[PDB]
Design a binder for this molecule. Sequence first.
Ligand SMILES: Nc1ncnc2c1ncn2[C@@H]1O[C@H](COP(=O)(O)OP(=O)(O)O)[C@@H](O)[C@H]1O
Ligand SMILES: Nc1ncnc2c1ncn2[C@@H]1O[C@H](COP(=O)(O)OP(=O)(O)O)[C@@H](O)[C@H]1O
Ligand SMILES: Nc1nc2c(ncn2[C@H]2C[C@H](O)[C@@H](COP(=O)(O)O)O2)c(=O)[nH]1
Ligand SMILES: Nc1nc2c(ncn2[C@H]2C[C@H](O)[C@@H](COP(=O)(O)O)O2)c(=O)[nH]1
Ligand code: NA
Ligand code: NA
Ligand code: NA
Ligand code: NA
Lengths: 209, 209
Amino acid sequence: TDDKKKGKFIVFEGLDRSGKSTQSKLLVEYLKNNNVEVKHLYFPNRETGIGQIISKYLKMENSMSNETIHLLFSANRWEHMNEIKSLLLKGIWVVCDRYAYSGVAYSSGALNLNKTWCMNPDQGLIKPDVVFYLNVPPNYAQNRSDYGEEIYEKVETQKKIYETYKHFAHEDYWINIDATRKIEDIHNDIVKEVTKIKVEPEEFNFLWS
Amino acid sequence: TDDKKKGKFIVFEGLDRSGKSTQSKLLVEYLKNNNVEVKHLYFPNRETGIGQIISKYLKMENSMSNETIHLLFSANRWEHMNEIKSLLLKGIWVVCDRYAYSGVAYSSGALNLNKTWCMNPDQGLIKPDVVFYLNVPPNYAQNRSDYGEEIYEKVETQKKIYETYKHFAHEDYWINIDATRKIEDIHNDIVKEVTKIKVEPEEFNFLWS
Ligand SMILES: Nc1ncnc2c1ncn2[C@@H]1O[C@H](COP(=O)(O)OP(=O)(O)O)[C@@H](O)[C@H]1O
Ligand SMILES: Nc1ncnc2c1ncn2[C@@H]1O[C@H](COP(=O)(O)OP(=O)(O)O)[C@@H](O)[C@H]1O
Ligand SMILES: Nc1nc2c(ncn2[C@H]2C[C@H](O)[C@@H](COP(=O)(O)O)O2)c(=O)[nH]1
Ligand SMILES: Nc1nc2c(ncn2[C@H]2C[C@H](O)[C@@H](COP(=O)(O)O)O2)c(=O)[nH]1
Ligand code: NA
Ligand code: NA
Ligand code: NA
Ligand code: NA
């Protein structure tokens, strides 16, 4: 009856097209190489029933009130908690593009919802060991593949989101990484910060502690 | 640029198969007769994308974590706020089977979620003028048409839900109605309590004030 967290849980955050996927795949490949068992997840997961509606929303194929889409994103997060506990419990690590901090930055920055009201439903989600924030200025990524395809990918929106991410900018678990560099440079900083991680089984923590 | 609430907003609450639909249809028919324009709504609304998943959940055709289904119910509530404001603004009344109080009683009573965590996401929903609680004891309705068809319709669950409804039992807007009587008796009590309602345009209020 051991229910200690054995794996470590790592989150990449950032504006749209900031290299989250690139970096998280790199981190994953590096951990498989160094023999850590690891599982790559991401939010939103567009493949569930809730995910499908989220996806129609991001493509501007439907529309919905600000409150409804926020709660759907949060529900999509909650449908992964058993899977996430499961893995962590098994000592498999979890590397995830996006988490609840996306809730605040996007729902509070782009959709102007109250910050506290946005955080409430995500309260009690599993807390990660570290979040890497791939920091790029609001106008930086407008030229990368496909940008502007989904609803929030306009620089003026990216500005507000960028401003709203600051709400976590000075937290302990939060590591600003300059993502205006070469892929390999970003990657080594991440690997370096990952190596400074304690490997011991511990208790789970929960948002927003 | 008038944005006063003109209509009145009435909610029926109660355990499963307690006569909500019966009473709300009666109230509606009575208001059309006395020449009030009125719109009958209900939650969950199973016809939207979110509604469809809620519906699969109640039929036990899928399953999901407690947190996810709660947030879907709350999202389903939020997708009706524009429609509800719209009507109230126009002076059309709204009579509704079920609202956010169902969130507490069901999510907190049957699914054992924390009461405050359940209320948070519904905070900011339009507050109704009155809630009629069709009060029946937990074992009372087990013999009415079709009972036991959906997930919460087992007396042991109805017990907890019944206990959890008490959280509103002593509030101002909340009117206990003995629903163990004849349809016509229940109806006259409701009509009598409805006639004691002030007809004047006012400001909107919001949950959980
Ligand atoms: N550091 C970088 N330099 C140049 N191109 C990059 C860099 N990082 C990512 N890209 C490219 O920019 C686009 C966005 O990358 P991606 O990992 O999918 O971002 P995100 O997950 O944030 O949406 C992709 O085409 C990716 O190849
Ligand atoms: N007071 C009553 N006496 C006898 N039968 C009733 C009474 N009220 C409702 N019913 C019947 O019991 C069942 C549940 O009624 P309904 O209005 O659909 O409940 P609810 O909306 O709470 O699910 C229906 O068959 C209804 O006709
Ligand atoms: N409003 C809001 N948007 C979110 C939330 N989580 C993710 N998003 C947005 C961020 C991205 O613009 C978008 C698409 O995701 P992607 O390309 O995978 O990072 O979803 C959330 O919780 N709230
Ligand atoms: N857990 C939970 N259940 C709800 C909520 N709202 C409604 N329900 C349940 C109450 C009823 O059992 C069920 C079916 O609705 P109905 O027959 O229309 O009253 O939905 C909610 O917010 N949370
Ligand atoms: Na994106
Ligand atoms: Na991505
Ligand atoms: Na029911
Ligand atoms: Na009903």
